[PDB]
């Protein structure tokens, strides 16, 4: 379950777009949603909830 | 922002701040 928690909390998740196609008629706002990214430092790996 | 301000639609790429410019009512908004 330590391996499972690492595999669940250190991921790169495709979170899509905020105005992604096919949009509604009249959409004027379009951006990219940045969800979960991979951890970089050891302190980020230390605060992984078991 | 306040009432009576003139915010800038169409023509954003060709214009930097601090530039003398002339204005026309824009046709890109819905109203």
């Amino acid at each position: 379950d330590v391996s499972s928690a690492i595999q669940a909390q250190n991921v790169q998740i495709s979170s899509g777009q905020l105005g992604g196609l096919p949009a509604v008629k009249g959409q004027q706002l379009n951006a990219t949603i940045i969800g979960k990214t991979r951890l970089q430092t050891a302190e980020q790996f230390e605060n992984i909830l078991l | 922002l306040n009432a009576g301000d003139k915010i800038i639609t169409e023509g954003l790429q060709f214009v930097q701040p601090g530039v003398e410019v002339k204005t026309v009512p824009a046709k890109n908004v819905a109203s």
């Binding site: 669940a8 909390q9 991921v11 998740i13 495709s14 979170s15 899509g16 777009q17 905020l18 105005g19 992604g20 196609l21 096919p22 949009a23 509604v24 008629k25 009249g26 959409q27 004027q28 706002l29 379009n30 951006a31 990219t32 949603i33 940045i34 969800g35 979960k36 909830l49 | 639609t9 169409e10 023509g11 954003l12 790429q13 060709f14 824009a26 890109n28």
Partner: protein
């Protein structure tokens, strides 16, 4: 010798070909509906103003040569055939300069217009292509000073035209921050949050199905009304371990950031690419040297590199070690082999500038430049100046 350096250099002075490229770039963060009303306004202009030359225009959106996204579109303009449009004003060089001047009326897009070179497998745009090979050794996104020199500080055009980006400016993005402590303390596990946010917005692909005897795909995504705004992030629910639904904004917030929608890696460092053409009247070599007074303003670490169809201008250049220095070197040997003397093969290669003296004059009077067809033309005129010499010196040497 002075008039040889007075002429400029080029490579393949290109042709009409009936084709024209035109790309648009709406400001960053624009939807495709904003791009379509620029693309259609460009399309309607070419079919009523320039109907004498333009045959048909094919406009795609969501994709150009600069990149991809909702803020990008391009047009393949196929013109009339060569006999249906007479007059030099119906060339693509006179259509491009008068459509590019009209495209400054379009305020909400950097619309351009350009032609491909004479070769089509090499290059997709006439003119120079220079890459900002920025070897400063810095971190991967602290190199924004290369971009700062790339915007206008490498665009100080004295005699250039249509100097344009080939990447795209960075845009706002929406960083969705989820704290795992509060989310886990309401029972809902984090892998289900990941699967919910990856299926509802990210359009998962589950398996395959078959219709009309062909295997196709089945996708899965939320409805378009539920993924348009940041508040629509708060419309989705996740089931915890007890079996009830937690809203998404009970454990997740959002925050705007700024990031690039395109990242490269060119020869070991992420460069930025600049396209541009010479102004009507001058050649390509003086344009590639007129950007050299622009590149002298530069920060630390960066450099300019010619590549693509501009790689041959700075890897071939003038082949003064090989072309017309070892070509006519061996003709002195092969005429000493047949004249059986030392000085009479020297005399017939002494008259070699008397042919190129008007070969330079004709391209100076017509206004052309030093290219590969000019080089292979001079390599004929060496033999032409030699064959007039040998035909009248053979009888001069046999009669003696």
């Amino acid at each position: 010798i002075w008039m040889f350096t007075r002429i400029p250099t080029a490579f393949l002075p290109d042709e009409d070909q009936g084709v024209l490229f035109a790309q648009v770039q709406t400001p960053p963060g624009s939807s495709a509906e904003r791009t379509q009303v620029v693309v259609d306004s460009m399309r309607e202009y070419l079919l009523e103003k320039e109907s004498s030359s333009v045959s048909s225009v094919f406009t795609v959106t969501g994709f150009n040569f600069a990149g991809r996204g909702q803020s990008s579109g391009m047009a393949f303009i196929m013109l009339k055939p060569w006999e249906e449009r007479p007059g030099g004003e119906n060339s693509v060089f006179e259509l491009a300069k008068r459509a590019q001047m009209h495209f400054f009326s379009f305020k909400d897009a950097m619309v351009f217009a350009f032609a491909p070179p004479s070769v089509l497998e090499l290059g997709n745009a006439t003119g120079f292509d220079l890459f900002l090979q920025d070897q400063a050794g810095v971190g991967h996104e602290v190199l924004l000073q290369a971009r700062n020199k790339f915007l206008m500080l490498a665009a100080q055009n004295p005699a250039l035209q249509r100097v344009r980006p080939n990447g795209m400016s960075d845009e706002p993005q929406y960083k969705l921050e989820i704290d795992d402590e509060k989310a886990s303390a309401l029972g809902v596990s984090l892998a289900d949050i990941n699967s919910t946010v990856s299926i509802a917005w990210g359009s998962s692909y589950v398996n395959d199905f078959i219709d009309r005897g062909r295997v196709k795909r089945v996708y899965l995504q939320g409805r378009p009304d539920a993924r348009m705004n940041p508040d629509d992030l708060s419309k989705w629910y996740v089931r915890n371990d007890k079996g009830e639904m937690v809203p998404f904004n009970a454990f997740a917030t959002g925050k705007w950031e700024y990031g690039s929608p395109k990242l490269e890696r060119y020869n070991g460092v992420p460069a930025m690419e600049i396209l541009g053409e010479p102004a009507p009247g001058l050649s390509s070599g003086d344009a590639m040297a007129a950007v050299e007074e622009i590149v002298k303003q530069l920060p630390k670490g960066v450099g300019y590199s010619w590549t693509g169809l501009s790689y041959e201008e700075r890897l071939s250049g003038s082949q003064a070690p090989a072309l017309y220095a070892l070509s006519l070197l061996v003709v002195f040997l092969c005429l000493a082999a047949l004249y059986e003397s030392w000085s009479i093969p020297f005399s017939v290669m002494l008259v070699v500038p008397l042919g190129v003296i008007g070969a330079l004059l004709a391209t100076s009077m017509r206004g052309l430049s030093n290219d590969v067809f000019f080089q292979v033309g001079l390599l004929t005129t060496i033999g032409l100046s030699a064959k007039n010499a040998i035909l009248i010196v053979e009888f001069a040497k046999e009669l003696h």
